[PDB]
Amino acid sequence: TELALFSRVNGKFSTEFQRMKTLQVKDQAVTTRVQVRNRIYTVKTTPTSE
Amino acid sequence: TGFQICKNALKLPVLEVLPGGGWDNLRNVDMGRVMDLT
């Protein structure tokens, strides 16, 4: 704002507002599942055992 | 009727997949030695 009256009385009025905003969200979800199953032998009793 | 005598001489594995065994046709699982293995 600038106001000059009678070419003698001067006035100035400078007003500034400034807002800055920042947001960051970061999500990580790692899931891991390992499953090993070995079956080597099948052992049975002889039918003629005691 | 062991195979250790042959293994001591030849020094070879014995073929572990052998026929002549029983078989449960229902449960689909080997059962017992029917033929004679010598």
Burial of B33 (0-12, 13-18, 19+ CB in 10 A): middle
**Ranges assigned E (strand) in B1-38:** 21-24, 29-33
Output B31-36 pairs: Cβ under 8 A, ≥24 positions apart: B32/A44, B32/A46, B32/A47, B36/B1
- Our measurement of the distance from residue A4's CA atom to the centroid of its chain's CA atoms, rounded to an integer in Å, reads 55
Chain B: closest CA distance from residue A27 (Å) = 50
Resolution of this model in Å is 3.0
CB pairs under 8 A between A and B: 6
* Four-residue CA torsion sign, A45, A47, A48, A49: positive
Alpha helices in B1-38 (DSSP H): 4-10
A45 at interface of B, judged by CB pairs closer than 8 A: no
> Which structural technique was applied?
cryo-EM
Look at the block and give the residue holding tokens 């052992």: A43
